[PDB]
């Protein structure tokens, strides 16, 4: 079983990278890499 | 490179004005005639920069 970590309220980030460009013709940009950690339950 | 086009356009319009003047001179004896004036108008192009 895996607990959901979609909502940003209780995600568990291990890494991150958030680039934000913006020029002004209001060109924009937003890159975002994220590495998560997840709960786990295993029964046999 | 595009500076050739403005000069060639100026030359062509000068040729047209010469044609107009020649047409004015040709009918120098037709009764009740009105001459044709001529002038050159500048037409700047508004690009992005410079």
């Amino acid at each position: 079983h895996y607990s959901p970590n979609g909502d940003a309220s209780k995600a568990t980030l291990r890494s991150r990278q958030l680039n934000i460009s913006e020029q002004v013709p209001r060109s924009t940009q937003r890159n975002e890499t994220s590495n998560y950690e997840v709960d786990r339950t295993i029964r046999h | 490179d595009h500076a050739i086009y403005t000069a060639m356009g100026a030359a062509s319009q000068t040729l047209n004005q010469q044609a107009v003047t020649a047409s004015n001179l040709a009918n120098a004896s037709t009764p009740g005639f009105r001459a044709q004036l001529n002038a050159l108008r500048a037409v700047p192009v508004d690009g992005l920069s410079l």
Binding site: - | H2, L48, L50
Partner: protein, 106 residues
């Protein structure tokens, strides 16, 4: 795979140099097409993204032109020469690295 990555840095640099050369050749060939927009790419950021599907940017015009053509000549010719020189530099660096790797096994 260590060899793969170690040569991959320069291989990707060379590949992006080739792509930029192709785009420069295209905008040289279409230099007299009215309604054309000059195109180019940002080599440094593109290489960073590839190391870590290619987007191209419109070159900033320098002088107006009635026929709607914005691809200059002198700036892109200097860019062509610089790109060719850097492509040759990358080629010889990769060749030197490969030969140095090879001659050890002799």
């Amino acid at each position: 795979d260590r060899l793969d990555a170690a040569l991959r840095f320069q291989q990707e640099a060379l590949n992006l140099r080739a792509q930029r050369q192709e785009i420069l050749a295209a905008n040289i060939a279409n230099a007299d097409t009215p309604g054309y927009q000059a195109r180019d790419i940002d080599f440094a950021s593109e290489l960073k993204k590839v190391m870590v599907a290619v987007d191209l940017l419109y070159r900033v015009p320098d002088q107006p032109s009635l026929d709607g053509n914005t691809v200059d000549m002198d700036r892109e010719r200097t860019q062509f020469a610089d790109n060719s020189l850097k492509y040759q530099m990358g080629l010889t660096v990769l060749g030197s690295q490969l030969k140095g790797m090879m001659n050890v096994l002799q």
